[PDB]
């Protein structure tokens, strides 16, 4: 059912989701305060075609930390879906940052037991995936181009700008929104009767300093995904546990400027 | 309800709808066997603006003939739909034949008490319609052009062309399905199960002869809309009597050879 | 069968098909020595749209004439072609010059027991109207236009020629042959191994006098289609012996010119 | 006869073909459990201009392992093909991969006695190679460029879709739809009475994972091709014996997550 | 005369033109049974101008082997073609692959005592070369550029096909078809009436392997040019042998899997 998939999904409400590579930063994202650690299998991405982390990996990371134990497969690939639910990762990350395996359609999310997450760039795109079955739902900015936040903030105000627009619109012209963006009517309805969409918002994309946790957690989003560019910076722990500290009390400036 | 909404619409399956102007017209296309007459006021159409006929007309013709009465309302002018199911029609024709009032919007079909009938050019718009709560479509050629009927049945064998690839396609593909034909996935899948849009399918556009309309009747659809054409010739009550022949007799040449 | 069909089709050969519109012209046409009268219901075309004539002509001119008595039916539509064949015509002449009802598709004359006469423009439809099932092929250039010859001699030596070149084609290339024309590859098999099109082949469009359907009988076809335009001059016997007895000696010059 | 060479090319069904390049990736091919070994001579590709194999090495493959040994010739090019059947060798590869000797036309297959595997990339191209004689069809996505998966599989979907839309057509638009594809109606007949194209199909192209062979199956292919990218990996025996593992189970998700 | 020219030019048919450039690929190329050796002054080109080799190399390679010794002069550059035939070689090749000297104009070949052979890419080519008095024409692919075989194949199937077309077009045409290849029309008859142009055809443009002489050769060529890049290979006179051994039994395929 998707009532217990998104129940299992939103414990991970106000928290930071860290990607980690390997048992020794698993447990570090552990230590630092992380809700669930997402797992990538590779030390570095020499300009190759990256895939489903290797099973081994994510069985030591599941042996080690006692968070929540993501995993990603590649966005139309049911296959590696398939093997990460028989390995029984908490959630699945059906991820685009990765190569795509299949660009036309997606993973039809309804077959599987294990909760999903999916990116979106728009409304649209986050009902389309909450349509497929999509327990969990991240605004993506870019990855694998910079450090930069200006992709992520400019998503997450459009989908936000797009669900109030929709909580106060006309009864008549729901109809037509929802053809002009694309998405299924009965979640638009969901939508503009509960006043978010009816999953979990995380952020992804540039987010590396307090300040740009804050910033995804103050224009309305759930959680945080750090990556792992946090990890090669002289002291990652200190840089996880000012993440985490900053999630969690978004609203307090002065906690802000002590984590910074 | 749109089962009950439904279940009133689907009396007129295998009839020939005809397009009546004043009483004689509309006890002429009773007595020919028409299973319902759509009221039009005008004598002719002077090149002007057309818009919802008078009332005092639909209740002259729905006091004469005992056939249902059908009327027609500006395709996104809910307040002439408003004004029809006052007066009692049995159904009310949100028709794009006449000016349209509304461009962007349609009518939300669910706040009315009487069955709905709208045009559509292939299957996206036909579910939208359905969606919005139409309870009878009609497949829409070329009205106001000629008597010609290559449109006509282009947009049915669009149709029927869709719903059979729909009713064959892949589980996974059914939801980028919807998204390329912009129509709601629950009918999308509903269709997917039925093999037939969950309306009564009507065809309209250039139908003048008996062929005509038994070609409509074969390639899938369950009537006609026979318009105002037919009044002006010779003899209207043998055409009329010809069409409705051919509508009931759709499969046997003969009787079709003697109507024409 | 399409064995049978043919043969009752390629009787015809050596003759020339006169589009007649009444009792009195098919009279003429049948005593001026035509080989089979196509009718056509009006006296004129008020530009309008055309469509299968009336049975009561075709009942009236069948038992009126004894020569063969096509019938034209619109492309695409199937329901007239059933009409058709219920009044026991002894051809049935898929036409493009009337109003075309199917853009996209055809007749598919192999559930009819009438022969079908289809139009074509080059070797690529004429193959696809053999596949569809015609036993028999008119190459057509311009109607409802003029009285030219141009368009007509045109697609005549087209075809012509692209049979010439499949004839001596080598093996390897008729697969890529029959791609870029389109065509179904055992039809063009057999063309190769036939030297012709495995039916019988007419002219049509623009035949006005002796030396042009001398100069279509000369290009290797097998007849030619007096169009209607002949009962409208000063004597339309005259011109009507003429034509028959020019098809019939189109080797000779002075008989030629004897009947111009 | 076409029967036989489709009988002996259907006894790879369910396995996968190993590209070696020598007597020993030849037996360690084997002895993974591949079902043929298709061979290619060079250690290396220097960006040069790729052709058949040298003879002897495909002699010495064909005395070492047991299992049926192909051969690569390119399209276009009958006398490499004369070659190669005048070695005996189970099976050729009319391969696209290796650079193109003829651009227009293909090998006229019926002239052979081995069979032969053709690539495609859509229905279209499919049929035209079954019609020109080839016993074995593979859907091919990016060879040379990367291992990605996105195009292999955007092939197998568009094939595995036209198949299924040609299965429920209505049988008047199957002309107009062996026009679109370009391909001949009698095997178009045959694959939609069939519900297959008649001839084995397999999939090529990025095909590195278990993962993906186990997609590349439960797309409904029949088998996979797996390139030489997997003998200059750490340890290429336990990649190949895991995804023949994979190949043989598609269905067990268990099974699938142990060899990965 | 254009008679004894031609005589003296047809000695070639069924044999090999290897490209030497000293006196030992000269001895080498007699050896391994070339029935002629093209000269080609230098040992490598350093991407500079290339031109008629230097005369006494010509003379040496002359004096050294007893075959044919041809020689290369650029196009439009008479003067070059006088020097050459004032050594007295055997045969003349106005060469397009040397830098061209006159874009715009050719050699008078007429005005010369030594037969010429001149490089076509289609029969409008090789015609006119014949009008202006080549006594051998070679169907040209593509040099300096790789060793692919794709132009070569596909300019010899474009000229055998216009020359299966010529035989078999209708006599009114005959002048049609010259003016749109831009052909002589006495030669164009004479390629009707002949079957084949009335020169010896050779190929170039790619040939390395036994497999591409032979293709060549059941194309319906005449010979084969085999450049310069045999000579830098491990054992040139294997390949030599082979490739003449291929050019001479270019029917039998046991021959042809020995020589590969």
């Given at each position: 059912?998707?009532?217990?998939?998104?129940?299992l999904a939103q414990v991970l409400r106000?928290?930071?989701?860290?990607?980690?590579?390997?048992?020794?930063?698993?447990?570090?994202?552990?230590?630092?305060?992380?809700?669930?650690?997402?797992?990538?299998?590779?030390?570095?991405?020499?300009?190759?075609?990256?895939?489903?982390?290797?099973?081994?990996?994510?069985?030591?990371?599941?042996?080690?930390?006692?968070?929540?134990?993501?995993?990603?497969?590649?966005?139309?690939?049911?296959?590696?879906?398939?093997?990460?639910?028989?390995?029984?990762?908490?959630?699945?990350?059906?991820?685009?940052?990765?190569?795509?395996?299949?660009?036309?359609?997606?993973?039809?999310?309804?077959?599987?037991?294990?909760?999903?997450?999916?990116?979106?760039?728009?409304?649209?795109?986050?009902?389309?995936?909450?349509?497929?079955?999509?327990?969990?739902?991240?605004?993506?900015?870019?990855?694998?181009?910079?450090?930069?936040?200006?992709?992520?903030?400019?998503?997450?105000?459009?989908?936000?700008?797009?669900?109030?627009?929709?909580?106060?619109?006309?009864?008549?012209?729901?109809?037509?929104?929802?053809?002009?963006?694309?998405?299924?009517?009965?979640?638009?309805?969901?939508?503009?009767?509960?006043?978010?969409?009816?999953?979990?918002?995380?952020?992804?994309?540039?987010?590396?300093?307090?300040?740009?946790?804050?910033?995804?957690?103050?224009?309305?989003?759930?959680?945080?995904?750090?990556?792992?560019?946090?990890?090669?910076?002289?002291?990652?722990?200190?840089?996880?546990?000012?993440?985490?500290?900053?999630?969690?009390?978004?609203?307090?400036?002065?906690?802000?400027?002590?984590?910074?």
């Amino acid at each position: 059912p998707f009532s217990v998939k998104v129940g299992l999904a939103q414990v991970l409400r106000g928290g930071a989701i860290v990607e980690v590579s390997s048992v020794n930063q698993a447990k570090l994202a552990e230590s630092a305060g992380a809700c669930s650690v997402i797992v990538s299998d590779p030390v570095r991405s020499r300009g190759g075609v990256r895939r489903m982390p290797d099973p081994v990996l994510i069985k030591e990371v599941k042996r080690a930390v006692s968070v929540p134990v993501m995993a990603r497969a590649r966005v139309g690939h049911f296959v590696e879906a398939q093997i990460l639910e028989s390995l029984a990762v908490d959630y699945i990350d059906e991820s685009e940052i990765i190569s795509v395996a299949d660009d036309d359609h997606f993973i039809n999310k309804h077959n599987f037991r294990s909760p999903f997450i999916c990116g979106c760039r728009d409304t649209g795109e986050a009902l389309r995936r909450i349509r497929e079955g999509a327990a969990m739902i991240r605004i993506q900015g870019d990855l694998t181009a910079t450090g930069n936040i200006a992709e992520t903030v400019k998503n997450v105000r459009s989908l936000m700008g797009e669900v109030r627009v929709l909580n106060n619109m006309d009864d008549d012209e729901v109809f037509t929104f929802a053809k002009k963006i694309s998405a299924p009517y009965d979640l638009v309805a969901q939508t503009k009767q509960m006043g978010r969409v009816p999953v979990v918002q995380f952020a992804s994309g540039g987010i590396t300093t307090p300040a740009d946790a804050a910033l995804m957690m103050q224009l309305g989003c759930d959680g945080v995904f750090v990556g792992s560019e946090v990890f090669d910076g002289p002291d990652p722990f200190k840089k996880l546990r000012s993440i985490v500290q900053a999630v969690q009390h978004y609203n307090d400036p002065h906690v802000l400027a002590e984590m910074s």
